[PDB]
């Protein structure tokens, strides 16, 4: 397609003020306390996979709510310990979990493990629908931080860490965070809300600068915002729905990142706007870099390969 | 736009086997005892609003799973006992409610609720999401009838019925069903469910001949079955989950409803196609009359809703 | 779907200099003193509808150009006299009359007129095509004043509020006016040109602004005037185009309302621009509100139902 | 894009009953009679057009309906009396009369004239609309034959050719009719109801076999018929729209033709379906020939601008 | 469609600095050498055309490379010399060489010459493909200006023109030039690099303002430049693509056309931007003459053709 | 979206008598000799690659024509000698070389290289543009066998087999051929012309019944073909187009794989439409498999991809 969103000279300094509400640290810290609660109860079932060369299996743990997280782990058929890596994805985009991909980042040499997200495929989500929502996921529970989707998935993403880490063939100082979109979020919420991560890598990061977000993108699944408000339409439901989501908003969670960030952006992404991406990239405060690709939109970018792969290999083979 | 299924003259005779398993009935049963446990505990909460005429209210009340399930409630400002109309909505269609559409049908004589369906708006879904679902709500806990996402639904629009039945101002034997597309498909679950409705009337009804439904319809909303399939290939899952649609398929319980009922369907409807619609009025055994529209689809047909009101006048007035 | 016009902070003061000509107030004295030549000789059809509470009808009457205009008639199955409502249709937008809202209005306790536009649906339009037009009605005879098309459309408006009127059942002192888009226009240039109506209520009209109409909607029926400049490209044809435009475009005839005005507009249509609603409303110079919908475009608002409701019930029923 | 119709080998046999009224006879000989009451009065006015080797003019004349119909007549400069041609254009589809192929035809030897349609370019429709249609022509005065928009039309065609006639300057002896779509239609309805033309070529001419064409077309306009009977829903509008439909149906006029007619007709053609367009053809009983294109559809076809020119200058230069 | 690039009062004045590179004139006078070298060797093979006073035949001359271009030639059956014009056709946009448009244009009176690019109908393209494109003509060969496509192709139409010229029936004196999109590029193009024509007609002219034209054009055929560089996506790879196409950019070789210019440009176009035609010819220094349209979009101009006609016939036939 | 062709019971049995002409072994075996003619001169060039476990190179290679073809090869870093594979990518669909993926295939144990198409990406494609054609290269030559763009690809894939297998590390005995859409259809005619594979897996395989594809395909590229006849639209040109593909259609060539093939198909497909694969499988005379998806399309699908890798491991490295 074609440019659309503000200039790139306009993007570079574009950095909206924080939304977080007073108590943001507060319902961080309270929820990594509940998460604490559960205990792991990691369990790895192998499976049959067509390579030499790797071991595969489900990987299956208990989060927040009691609830059963799965995905594909593969690791290299060798004497570990292995750098690792925590690889999240795409809304409503994973397919079978990505199984292949799994076992190429193994075959590059990463216990790789691969986190499914909750009532999205094979994850379960034990967190109820308390007050209706659009179709989606985005805006369940919604009207309050307490019952919303991201809470859940959050703590999810950060327990995936803390399990792989647990691994006697895992070196937990070399493990590294990754994932486009919605993939792209979780890394980075992941990494501002653990010390485990050594590196991240995200693409066009979702769930961010939630305001302009919904007033910018062309595209699906930040409208899904738009419409819950369109279902429901008292302006104190707007206003509820927005102060919950600026606790999720990674543009708020950003500042705590403490490792080497590496971000893309396609200038022609309808689905995460530029704005909100480098809105992300401008409230970290640590050793990052962005990669900015003109001709490309909310896809697989090949020379942003080449880059995660270099920066993987830079940071946690060193 | 145009046509697309089957001629008419096809349609008239389209008839498909009955695929409920042999646990069908049992299924159901099981189900009715389980809601049956769960103290209904209805509430009325008088809301104001701008007509006279007219007595307004948020009905909630407990049903399966100890779901809080609510609606709009407006009766005749008149002393009762009066005939009255269980409304169910479209899926993922209910703008706060549709209150306004839930006044006018009692100014029209009946009082009326708006059930509003659990996780779509306003009311609750307490059940969970057990392995992970294709974006929307049609494939919610699909492996199992159990878990099944309309298992609760259709639960709770039995509910309805015994709610407002026993409110001393309505007439409980004299109360319709009516509803559109998802609507449509739990105007006659219920009427099969529940001996408690008098007369129906279903608009293109959905939820029915899910076999063809996947390989016909050309939009949504019975084509995330077929999402789910492409995120989720087992060949045992495809089977597994067309056996727990059996158990919900309006076809299956067409056969149960004994009461009058009028139904309607355009032909251009790419969304409930017409084979589909036909194939469930074609199970029922009881006093029917299928309306077709060459020239609609999938919205509101200005003739039916003449046809609509004066069966409903016919049955419940008298 | 999403933001296209002018931010909502420079929308609040968007009001364009008139374009009236220096002969608009004669042209509108002697449009009405030609409708007033014609005598109403209004009918009433009893019609059958299945409802109590309420007596239908079709009503017909003469107007401008000596052209049967009709619509369907409701009044409350009550000792009058009653509040009553004038309600237009929008472009090409009518399904057999409206027919169910009608009685809908009259259940609420107005005696109700929902005119049929002449040559859209049931009323007769009698002026002919002088010249030759684009695809639709606007501009039908838009090289002249006298010829062109809204100018039998709204001497009808007129007439309608006449006719009303003059009924034993109806409240004169208590007549309101409403409609959207199309409807909406009609709303304001009822009250406009009559001092009958006593209360207004517009959704998102149309036939505003017409110059920034042209170059800022995306969708039809305003670029139909665009159409008939690619067919009709003589550089005069254009400026004897606009110029006729400018007798009917309501920002021109906005300054005439004396009675309370209730408007709608979301900020995602396309159809009626909010530039072009706004442009209107800023050229109203009475008791005046308008309802501004982010999430809504060119369609039904559930929220602004009932301000309108409350509205229409505040003043006619006082 | 692609085929979609019957095959060829269905579409060659494909010939519909006649749906003429048992009065077809007597509604076009009492139609012509209320044609030849109007005196033609032609009036020929010279323009400035740069091109050397032909005169123009803009050709009026008076026909059914005190109407005054127009458009471009160039002749070659040189002394005649010259054959010629009767062109008619697409519905909707005439960008200033098109001058630059009227000048182009008589520079190709033939005393031309473009007869725009009453109400869609220059030439006024002095009837009036009725009862209300669908946005369009199609459906203006489709309740009677006698107030069908295409009546007025088709003895506009006819007085063209008898104007042309006329003229001490064209042999009466050599004149063709031709157009595309709906100058296809005229180009048959005036060759049978005239027996002036000499030969005709009709491009996938339109108004034929509506029961059909209603039922197969995905384009417009013949989707104007679907739209007029969504907004006026009685069976027996429908009934009488179809009837009236009939009289101006080519395929029930086509067997009146006796002269030779070349037709052309595309297989992806999506607004004049082959089938219709077969349906046409097969009903001719005269020296005939159907050019078929597999590759195009409703559009200039270069390969057939050759046979056109070679049939015209075959018949009506020798 | 609707207005969409800068508004008309900034594209009067939008004027990019030149983006030759310091050997752009050494460039063409090396390659006007090569085409040189090469002998025009022109064939006329007459064909039967169904028209009278005019001859028509297929040119085929060769050219840069050795490649052999065709197009159609007629000239007025008359005594000549006749003034001239060669037509240079729209990108993959000739349909079996446009043989009736040049018949018209011999019937106006001119000897003429429909060049047809090679590759694209019927000319040779013997240029290889030296690095791999994207789908299109736009990107082959792009990484050297020598072995760029358009290198071919200007030359080739400069050939065009000394072969009419060359022939005895043709005044050289009274040669013009036109053509649309791609032929408006070529026109100009021809302009600039022969002293040849006497008058440039160029319809919205396409190859200009390259820079401009990737980041505003939302339709093909400026897009395959941004396909390209999705698929080979190296930096230096951009930049030495942006350098071939600088000398072949209209607006670079626009200074050098001393012959009157008539040019056109539709507002709604969004194939050859208004801005990018605006920069060509506010690159003009010659006499020349912008007709804008603020209707029409990259398409036939009905007002244009009357203008190009003038100009032409003023001109040429002085 | 959904299903659009023959349904699978007639898929099954789909299969359309040969096309091949009484010549098409002689035009082979030349076409191979043509190709012997030319010394191979392979050149490999090391790449800096971040990725340990390989070695990256770009590999050249002189083929038919004197072209230089070129894509990855990468090889596991570990002494032979391999299995190895040859991969052959969809039409204009290599960003790059996908590089990445063939790292993954040495990863895998693959000596692997990724043939990069003659004028697609970076190689370079020698044979000229004989007689004009459609955007695109499925057109290019298309007039004669020995110019069609096809002759010098296909010569270029067997060239491919013989380039790798010529090294130490690569054990000629263990070489595959894979590739989806034109990718597939390489795949298949590499193994019928060469006997160098020992296994083929293709993904939906493109450049199959090349008559039904043309009628029956609703996207790109098949339809380049009805483009090139839109614009070339003599009867004669299209016979002889269908005859110089009826060479080099793999339903005609695949009666000469005699390896295992594995193959796969989606049914709603519309690029590669599921009769067209179909067809070329039931060609096969060999060990084979065609797996088919229900709900996939023209793209990824995961289970095939671990039934490819299966494949491949069993036969090539056992």
């Given at each position: 397609?074609?440019?659309?969103?503000?200039?790139?000279?306009?993007?570079?300094?574009?950095?909206?003020?924080?939304?977080?509400?007073?108590?943001?640290?507060?319902?961080?810290?309270?929820?990594?306390?509940?998460?604490?609660?559960?205990?792991?109860?990691?369990?790895?079932?192998?499976?049959?996979?067509?390579?030499?060369?790797?071991?595969?299996?489900?990987?299956?743990?208990?989060?927040?709510?009691?609830?059963?997280?799965?995905?594909?782990?593969?690791?290299?058929?060798?004497?570990?310990?292995?750098?690792?890596?925590?690889?999240?994805?795409?809304?409503?985009?994973?397919?079978?979990?990505?199984?292949?991909?799994?076992?190429?980042?193994?075959?590059?040499?990463?216990?790789?493990?691969?986190?499914?997200?909750?009532?999205?495929?094979?994850?379960?989500?034990?967190?109820?629908?308390?007050?209706?929502?659009?179709?989606?996921?985005?805006?369940?529970?919604?009207?309050?931080?307490?019952?919303?989707?991201?809470?859940?998935?959050?703590?999810?993403?950060?327990?995936?860490?803390?399990?792989?880490?647990?691994?006697?063939?895992?070196?937990?100082?070399?493990?590294?965070?990754?994932?486009?979109?919605?993939?792209?979020?979780?890394?980075?919420?992941?990494?501002?809300?653990?010390?485990?991560?050594?590196?991240?890598?995200?693409?066009?990061?979702?769930?961010?600068?939630?305001?302009?977000?919904?007033?910018?993108?062309?595209?699906?699944?930040?409208?899904?915002?738009?419409?819950?408000?369109?279902?429901?339409?008292?302006?104190?439901?707007?206003?509820?729905?927005?102060?919950?989501?600026?606790?999720?908003?990674?543009?708020?969670?950003?500042?705590?990142?403490?490792?080497?960030?590496?971000?893309?952006?396609?200038?022609?992404?309808?689905?995460?706007?530029?704005?909100?991406?480098?809105?992300?990239?401008?409230?970290?405060?640590?050793?990052?870099?962005?990669?900015?690709?003109?001709?490309?939109?909310?896809?697989?970018?090949?020379?942003?390969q080449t880059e995660k792969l270099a920066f993987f290999k830079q940071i946690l083979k060193g």
């Amino acid at each position: 397609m074609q440019l659309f969103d503000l200039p790139l000279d306009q993007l570079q300094t574009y950095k909206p003020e924080k939304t977080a509400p007073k108590d943001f640290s507060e319902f961080w810290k309270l929820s990594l306390e509940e998460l604490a609660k559960v205990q792991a109860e990691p369990d790895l079932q192998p499976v049959d996979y067509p390579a030499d060369g790797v071991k595969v299996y489900r990987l299956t743990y208990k989060s927040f709510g009691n609830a059963r997280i799965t995905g594909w782990y593969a690791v290299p058929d060798k004497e570990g310990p292995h750098p690792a890596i925590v690889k999240y994805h795409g809304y409503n985009a994973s397919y079978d979990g990505e199984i292949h991909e799994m076992v190429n980042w193994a075959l590059h040499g990463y216990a790789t493990f691969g986190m499914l997200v909750r009532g999205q495929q094979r994850s379960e989500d034990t967190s109820i629908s308390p007050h209706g929502h659009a179709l989606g996921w985005m805006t369940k529970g919604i009207l309050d931080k307490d019952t919303y989707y991201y809470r859940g998935v959050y703590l999810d993403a950060v327990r995936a860490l803390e399990v792989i880490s647990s691994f006697d063939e895992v070196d937990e100082t070399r493990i590294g965070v990754t994932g486009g979109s919605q993939g792209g979020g979780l890394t980075i919420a992941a990494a501002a809300l653990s010390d485990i991560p050594k590196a991240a890598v995200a693409d066009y990061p979702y769930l961010s600068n939630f305001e302009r977000a919904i007033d910018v993108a062309l595209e699906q699944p930040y409208l899904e915002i738009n419409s819950f408000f369109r279902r429901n339409g008292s302006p104190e439901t707007e206003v509820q729905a927005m102060k919950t989501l600026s606790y999720f908003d990674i543009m708020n969670l950003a500042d705590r990142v403490k490792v080497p960030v590496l971000m893309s952006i396609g200038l022609i992404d309808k689905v995460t706007p530029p704005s909100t991406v480098f809105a992300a990239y401008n409230h970290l405060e640590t050793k990052k870099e962005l990669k900015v690709y003109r001709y490309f939109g909310h896809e697989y970018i090949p020379a942003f390969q080449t880059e995660k792969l270099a920066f993987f290999k830079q940071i946690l083979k060193g």
